[model samples]
Target chain A: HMGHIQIPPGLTELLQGYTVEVLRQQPPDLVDFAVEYFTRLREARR
Target chain B: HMGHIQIPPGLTELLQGYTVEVLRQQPPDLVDFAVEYFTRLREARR
Candidate 1:
């Protein structure tokens, strides 16, 4: 199972295939970091 | 000295520099913010 997922659709396609393990919820930084990197990367590319 | 050029890829070859800048034109969100930031820095020089 993919477990509890929260990634947005537009980002899913870009982040597809990459698997992230959510080891906690109280401090959701990993997921944020992953997407934030993508967001930053997406911005820098142009 | 390097010839006239765009910024060299700075992805460190870790992700093979797999970059995408297309999202910049799609909206005036984070992408635009970064672009404008970069542009403003450049514009400040001239």
Candidate 2:
């Protein structure tokens, strides 16, 4: 069984938003889109 | 418009697998599950 783990405060919102966008856009290359998406997210957070 | 970006070879599989598992489990705390999932994934890779 999977054990619970603590995540960073905003990580849930971050991932949720990203997942929704992914579903909406349905990019041809999911990996590429995730890479760019997270990269921009990280930059914005900094 | 979203631009194309490059991801490391295995990153796609990693993310896809994680997403699939998330859907399957429908965990109450997605962030927590993702934290553990990716942490284990990272460890396995190392």
Candidate 3:
């Protein structure tokens, strides 16, 4: 049997924040918004 | 001034569910997984 997948640190929080922003913005293109949102977040981490 | 964006009904719940699943599965390609996840959900809503 497959054990539960291991979630990386901060992954849940990151996605939670993204979900909140998506609701707040309600962008016309959700996938595009997600791409940009995460891309910016990734850049900011550096 | 821009007013706050209107979130659709169930959108927050939907995203929350998706986020949970992502953490549980820990898919290697998140973007691809998101695309498939939403696509399946959209199709199922019909």
Candidate 4:
């Protein structure tokens, strides 16, 4: 069985209210994408 | 140079309309993610 790994709460917290369509518009660098994702996620929460 | 691997044309094409936010919403299995990513990418092209 593929052991399911829960995505980190921080990451999930960052992801709230975001849908997949939103993430796809960012550039292709995963690290950069994540950094930006976190920032945006935080902003969205505010 | 981080000998950049151009995300295969096929992959990029698949990723065209997709953003990081879109991908994050995906279930966390990387293999599944890729399989679906490829499938969606192909469909995006068609």
Scored by lDDT, the top model is: 3
At residue A35, candidate 2 shows an lDDT of: 53
lDDT of 3 by residue, A1-46 (tens): 8777454665566677877888778687665566566556545545
Interface DockQ of candidate 2: 0.09
TM-score of chain B of each: 0.33, 0.62, 0.70, 0.39
Q: For model 3, what is the C-alpha lDDT against the true structure? A: 0.66
Q: What is the DockQ of each candidate?
A: 0.05, 0.09, 0.13, 0.05
Better-scoring candidate (DockQ), 2 or 4:
2
The C-alpha lDDT values of all candidates are: 0.38, 0.61, 0.66, 0.42
Could you give candidate 2's per-residue lDDT for residues B12-42 as a string of tens digits?
A: 4666787678767867755456556644544
Clashing pairs in 2: none
Error of 3 at B34 (Å): 0.5
Ordered by DockQ, highest first, the candidates read: 3, 2, 4, 1
List, in the given order, the native-contact fraction of each candidate.
0.04, 0.00, 0.00, 0.00
Candidate 2 local lDDT, A1-46, one digit each (tens): 5987544265457666866787678788654565566555544544
lDDT: which is higher, 1 or 3? Answer: 3
RMSD of each: 16.9, 10.3, 6.4, 14.8
Residue pairs with backbone atoms closer than 3 Å in model 1 (clashes): A45-B21, A46-B21
Which prediction has the highest DockQ against the true structure?
3
Candidate 2: fraction of native contacts reproduced: 0.00
How many clashing pairs in candidate 4? 10
Q: How well does chain A score by TM in each candidate?
A: 0.33, 0.66, 0.68, 0.38
